[PDB]
Design a protein around this nucleic acid. Sequence first.
RNA 1: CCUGAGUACGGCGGAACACGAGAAAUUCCGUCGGAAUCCGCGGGGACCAUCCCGCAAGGCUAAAUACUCCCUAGUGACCGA
RNA 2: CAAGUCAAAGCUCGUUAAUGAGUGAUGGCGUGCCUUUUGUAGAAUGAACCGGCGAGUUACGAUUGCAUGCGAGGUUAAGUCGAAGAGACGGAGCCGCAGCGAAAGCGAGUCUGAAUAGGGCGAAUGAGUAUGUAGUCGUAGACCCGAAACCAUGUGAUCUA
RNA 3: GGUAGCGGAGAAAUUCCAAACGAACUUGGAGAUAGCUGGUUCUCUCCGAAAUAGCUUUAGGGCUAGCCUCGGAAUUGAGAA
RNA 4: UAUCCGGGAGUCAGACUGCGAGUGAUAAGAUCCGUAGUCGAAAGGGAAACAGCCCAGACCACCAGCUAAGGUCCCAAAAUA
RNA 5: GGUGUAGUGGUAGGAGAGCGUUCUAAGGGCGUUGAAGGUCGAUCGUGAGGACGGCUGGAGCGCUUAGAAGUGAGAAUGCCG
RNA 6: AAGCGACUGUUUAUCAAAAACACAGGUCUCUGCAAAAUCGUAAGAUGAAGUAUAGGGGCUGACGCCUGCCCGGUGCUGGAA
RNA 7: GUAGCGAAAUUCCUUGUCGGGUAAGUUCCGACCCGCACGAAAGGCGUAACGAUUUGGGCACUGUCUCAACGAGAGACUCGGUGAAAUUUUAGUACCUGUGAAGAUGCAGGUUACCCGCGACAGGACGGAAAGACCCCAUGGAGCUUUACUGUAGUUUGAUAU
RNA 8: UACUACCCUUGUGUUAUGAACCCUCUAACCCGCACCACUAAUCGUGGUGGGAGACAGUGUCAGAUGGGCAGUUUGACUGGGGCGGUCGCCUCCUAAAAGGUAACGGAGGCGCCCAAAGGUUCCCUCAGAAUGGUUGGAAAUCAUUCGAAGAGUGUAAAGGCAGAAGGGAGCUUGACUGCGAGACCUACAAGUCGAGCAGGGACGAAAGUCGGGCUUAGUGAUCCGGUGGUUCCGCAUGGAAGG
Lengths: 97, 74, 64
Amino acid sequence: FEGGQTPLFRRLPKRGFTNINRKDYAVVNLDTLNRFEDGTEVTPVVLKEAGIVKNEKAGIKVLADGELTKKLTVKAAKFSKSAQEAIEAAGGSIEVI
Amino acid sequence: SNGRDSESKRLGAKSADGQTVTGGSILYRQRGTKIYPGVNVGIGGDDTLFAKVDGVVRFERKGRDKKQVSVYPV
Amino acid sequence: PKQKTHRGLAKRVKRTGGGGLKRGRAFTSHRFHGKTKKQRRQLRKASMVAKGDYKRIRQQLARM
RNA sequence: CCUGAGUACGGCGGAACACGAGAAAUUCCGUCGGAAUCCGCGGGGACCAUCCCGCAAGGCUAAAUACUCCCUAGUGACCGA
RNA sequence: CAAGUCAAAGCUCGUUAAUGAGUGAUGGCGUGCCUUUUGUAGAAUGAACCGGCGAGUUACGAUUGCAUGCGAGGUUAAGUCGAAGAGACGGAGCCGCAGCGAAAGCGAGUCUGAAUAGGGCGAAUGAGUAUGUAGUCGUAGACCCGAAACCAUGUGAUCUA
RNA sequence: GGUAGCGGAGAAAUUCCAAACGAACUUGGAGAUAGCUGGUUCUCUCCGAAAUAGCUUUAGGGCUAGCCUCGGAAUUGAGAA
RNA sequence: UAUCCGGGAGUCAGACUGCGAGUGAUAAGAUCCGUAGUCGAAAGGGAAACAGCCCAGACCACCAGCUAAGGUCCCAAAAUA
RNA sequence: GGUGUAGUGGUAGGAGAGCGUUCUAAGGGCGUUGAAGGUCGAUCGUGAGGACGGCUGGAGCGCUUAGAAGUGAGAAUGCCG
RNA sequence: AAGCGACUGUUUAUCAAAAACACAGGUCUCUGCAAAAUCGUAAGAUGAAGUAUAGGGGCUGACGCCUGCCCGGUGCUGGAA
RNA sequence: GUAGCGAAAUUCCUUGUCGGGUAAGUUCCGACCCGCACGAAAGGCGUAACGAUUUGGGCACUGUCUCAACGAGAGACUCGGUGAAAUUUUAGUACCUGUGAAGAUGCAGGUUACCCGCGACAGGACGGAAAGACCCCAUGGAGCUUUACUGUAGUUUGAUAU
RNA sequence: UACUACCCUUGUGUUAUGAACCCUCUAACCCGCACCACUAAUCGUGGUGGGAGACAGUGUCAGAUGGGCAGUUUGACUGGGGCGGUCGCCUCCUAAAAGGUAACGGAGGCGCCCAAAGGUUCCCUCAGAAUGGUUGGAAAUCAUUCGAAGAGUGUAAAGGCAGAAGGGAGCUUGACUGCGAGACCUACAAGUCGAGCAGGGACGAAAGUCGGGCUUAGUGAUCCGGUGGUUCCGCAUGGAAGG
Ligand SMILES: [K+]
Ligand SMILES: [K+]
Ligand SMILES: [K+]
Ligand SMILES: [K+]
Ligand SMILES: [K+]
Ligand SMILES: [K+]
Ligand SMILES: [K+]
Ligand SMILES: [K+]
Ligand SMILES: [K+]
Ligand SMILES: [K+]
Ligand SMILES: [K+]
Ligand SMILES: [Mg+2]
Ligand SMILES: [Mg+2]
Ligand SMILES: [Mg+2]
Ligand SMILES: [Mg+2]
Ligand SMILES: [Mg+2]
Ligand SMILES: [Mg+2]
Ligand SMILES: [Mg+2]
Ligand SMILES: [Mg+2]
Ligand SMILES: [Mg+2]
Ligand SMILES: [Mg+2]
Ligand SMILES: [Mg+2]
Ligand SMILES: [Mg+2]
Ligand SMILES: [Mg+2]
Ligand SMILES: [Mg+2]
Ligand SMILES: [Mg+2]
Ligand SMILES: [Mg+2]
Ligand SMILES: [Mg+2]
Ligand SMILES: [Mg+2]
Ligand SMILES: [Mg+2]
Ligand SMILES: [Mg+2]
Ligand SMILES: [Mg+2]
Ligand SMILES: [Mg+2]
Ligand SMILES: [Mg+2]
Ligand SMILES: [Mg+2]
Ligand SMILES: [Mg+2]
Ligand SMILES: [Mg+2]
Ligand SMILES: [Mg+2]
Ligand SMILES: [Mg+2]
Ligand SMILES: [Mg+2]
Ligand SMILES: [Mg+2]
Ligand SMILES: [Mg+2]
Ligand SMILES: [Mg+2]
Ligand SMILES: [Mg+2]
Ligand SMILES: [Mg+2]
Ligand SMILES: [Mg+2]
Ligand SMILES: [Mg+2]
Ligand SMILES: [Mg+2]
Ligand SMILES: [Mg+2]
Ligand SMILES: [Mg+2]
Ligand SMILES: [Mg+2]
Ligand SMILES: [Mg+2]
Ligand SMILES: [Mg+2]
Ligand SMILES: [Mg+2]
Ligand SMILES: [Mg+2]
Ligand SMILES: [Mg+2]
Ligand SMILES: [Mg+2]
Ligand SMILES: [Mg+2]
Ligand SMILES: [Mg+2]
Ligand SMILES: [Mg+2]
Ligand SMILES: [Mg+2]
Ligand SMILES: [Mg+2]
């Protein structure tokens, strides 16, 4: 309250809306997966059992920030293109649940 | 009646002689060109002087009785 | 009872990564013939909430 | 052949639903009008089609839940005129 | 002489025995306490005095700091067992680790934009979380007292009309 | 014996309705509200203000900045004379 | 000592003196600004007494000394210099 | 722990250190050879305050550490006596 | 002798006894009887166990002489294309 | 704006002007009418009687007064008994001048003053009683008014049902 | 042209239907109308007559009226308050040679205009005085000289401008789009200037200038609605509604 002066919230405009059908995915940034033994199969079940991902919000999305150093048969809901490149270049294999 | 006036606008110099300054800075606000532009200096719609590149501000007499601003870089 | 979130702020700001707040601008609704185009294009660009204002509204939009 | 008729529903006016008529679904009250029934009916937040789910307008139903005038056994980093 | 203080004669006593106690002629200086005020000795306010009582607390949340545990994993809630306990179980859920955008959506990038442009917000710079504790804020009377008043029951014509 | 408070009665004055009636008394909501006055209790140490700007159906109130304090931090040491 | 980050405030009634201006009657212990000081929030010494003037900033003790403004015939320390 | 330098007026206010009260857990100890409380003392500590004695009194109370608070009164035209 | 009110009465229990209220009288207006008006959710009741020479409401206020002009406006009554 | 009244319970100017009353009359009585701003049922003009009505004059009467004096009784006063209250920071509670939150018992300078009481008075203690009722403020309250706003009970009109 | 039928406008009728309206009926409703019974009852319930009558009354909905009643509103500044005046913005002075700086201190303006009064390229320089000359004057217009600004600059004042920002003529529309390092001011919200980049252009031979005007006023939040576009969303799906 600014003393009757027009408050900051009131002098500004509302913006946007919310999409009820929004898909918010749980993020795995490619530096985690250096954990797992090469050749194995990464899944949301594996990630949850390890404790990496506790909230599979809408599905796992994989993103490429860190450097990958393994072969991995990774699978998820969606991959980013840089992650596809990095995995397939290391020698893994992308799938989609 | 007489009781009214406008917001005083903060004219006059804003950068000093011998002062290094960034490009795009402001050197002298004014209404009417009480000081002219010079080297590496422009002039706005409101006759305000601004340095186009870095350098030290230098004010100079433009001959007898008119003044100049200049910005010589390093 | 837990805090109540100021919904009029929740509709008018957004958290960034440093915790700061994004905001729409004012002078951007209905009266544009009185404003130059530099103002219009510079006001369709969002800005950030002030230091002293965040000091005043953070308790309201604490978590949001 | 039957499967709850002046009923569901609709109009007007009002309420309760987080929801202040608002795009306002759903539920209920008053008033007036007013369906079909298994190839049927209602819902899925205006609404139409498709799909899915269910079958109102008849009734009952313990348990977990709330509370202590009271009774018994007691307890307190509660009081001590 | 806001009544004391400082110095001090005289007199009388003798201690938690140490530059002792009590009294005090006389002299110097000196306009109480609180509140509220630019400013009060105040002829501005309060208090007759004594004694008791009598005002920032708690619950749930938020945030900051300090401390501890663990650490890009930190943690359970309800409920069960069990001293009205600790503890164990309980991973549902919460925070953080990835953001950007109104959103679709993309993703260490994203949005704006025709745009490899520039710019904004972010990352490479990195540390959070559970509990306790203290400061502060919010919702609840929220620090204590204090209105005239408002509303909803009821009671009253033994007074008076 | 009758009229009772969103009222009654009134040869009418704002008058009377159980010793203050421009709306009785009592109980409850209720610890109403009070930007208003009064009060708010032990000690020492370190540091130490303001009575200004702007906006305010605002002007004896409040919000931000300014002025104070405490903790952290870094920076070509910017500060003061 | 400045800056940045964060916690906590309080302050928005100011007064006088000197200088610079306005309003005023170049009157006001008037009013409103600027500027500096003091008070406020500052005891002490002088101005008889006297927040705001002149000197000066109380951590304590001393029956020690040197000075400030102001003073030296008595009250009342110091020169009837 | 010591030497040196510099500083230590203070309201609102911020920060840090404490004294005291009641209770609790533990440890330890003191009380009919006289506890607490009361009262007088010329005592110790920088302060809050803490002991030791004399008389009264007649049964519970200290000390160390830590914790929890109905934790400290001189003012409220305060309430009760 | 003058003003006010015609009169007797009533009035602010507890600062106003009055020129204020009432009063008989006058005038206007409404009301045909389940009256009108009023109390009350409604029943029911007063009005009235009355009936336009009765009742209700407004104004004026004994008695005497009088009571002028204005229906444009605001109301009311009636009307109607 | 008529009749009628008119410095009026109405007239400011105004103690209007004139006359009467008085030695002297801002009041009173009677006329005038520049009616600031009378006026006809918010009734106008007049009116016998009436009035704890208001106003002015006169006679009588007197302590109202000139100008106080005396007496009586109750209290006050002394003694005995009994026994409150308001108020109250502490008080060994002088005066002038000045100072100072601008009006001092308390500060200064000077002066005066043996200690303690009794009866009386009431100048001060900005005395007591009472959180000023005048004033201003509160984004206070209450009652009241209305061609303020928004509504509503009733009244009325219509549609529909019975 | 007769005549046959398909028939079509227009206005007459029969029948069935739908409304509106007037009268009539009685059987609903009603009667503080009478009589009988319950019953000793001015209640009430029934019965029989009579009257009114599908009206009234009641319910719902709607319109008008409605201080009869209720809840509320009824600015601030201010040498007390009130009136006057003022409240937003621009310019000067005050304002004390940076900036800022108050008063119910002094003076004035604004709530627009311009499609050229913008941009660019090219060109030009004013006011007044003297002299002379017809109507023609004190003064129109012409010519020479004097002429440094004594003019003009859309509009107030200040600052500035004669290397023009003043004036005139061509070509145009940069009075563009996305932006924008960085600075000024700033409590916040806002405001101001801005080189430079990219796209696509104007003018000009080209340099190069052009993101309105000579600079500073010509304006106001959010909410709420409206219009156009959109590659956005669309409550299970597709749409739609609606955002
Ligand atoms: K609805
Ligand atoms: K003494
Ligand atoms: K914490
Ligand atoms: K930690
Ligand atoms: K000081
Ligand atoms: K106490
Ligand atoms: K009329
Ligand atoms: K007259
Ligand atoms: K008159
Ligand atoms: K006296
Ligand atoms: K009121
Ligand atoms: Mg406002
Ligand atoms: Mg411009
Ligand atoms: Mg828009
Ligand atoms: Mg339905
Ligand atoms: Mg219905
Ligand atoms: Mg008891
Ligand atoms: Mg006791
Ligand atoms: Mg004294
Ligand atoms: Mg006092
Ligand atoms: Mg007192
Ligand atoms: Mg009320
Ligand atoms: Mg009785
Ligand atoms: Mg009255
Ligand atoms: Mg309540
Ligand atoms: Mg001086
Ligand atoms: Mg003054
Ligand atoms: Mg000064
Ligand atoms: Mg103060
Ligand atoms: Mg001093
Ligand atoms: Mg003082
Ligand atoms: Mg010496
Ligand atoms: Mg001497
Ligand atoms: Mg200090
Ligand atoms: Mg010191
Ligand atoms: Mg004890
Ligand atoms: Mg206590
Ligand atoms: Mg006491
Ligand atoms: Mg008279
Ligand atoms: Mg009478
Ligand atoms: Mg009488
Ligand atoms: Mg009386
Ligand atoms: Mg009358
Ligand atoms: Mg006369
Ligand atoms: Mg008449
Ligand atoms: Mg009259
Ligand atoms: Mg009349
Ligand atoms: Mg009369
Ligand atoms: Mg005085
Ligand atoms: Mg004096
Ligand atoms: Mg003194
Ligand atoms: Mg006596
Ligand atoms: Mg008094
Ligand atoms: Mg008062
Ligand atoms: Mg009747
Ligand atoms: Mg009202
Ligand atoms: Mg209210
Ligand atoms: Mg005011
Ligand atoms: Mg005034
Ligand atoms: Mg200046
Ligand atoms: Mg859909
Ligand atoms: Mg759906």
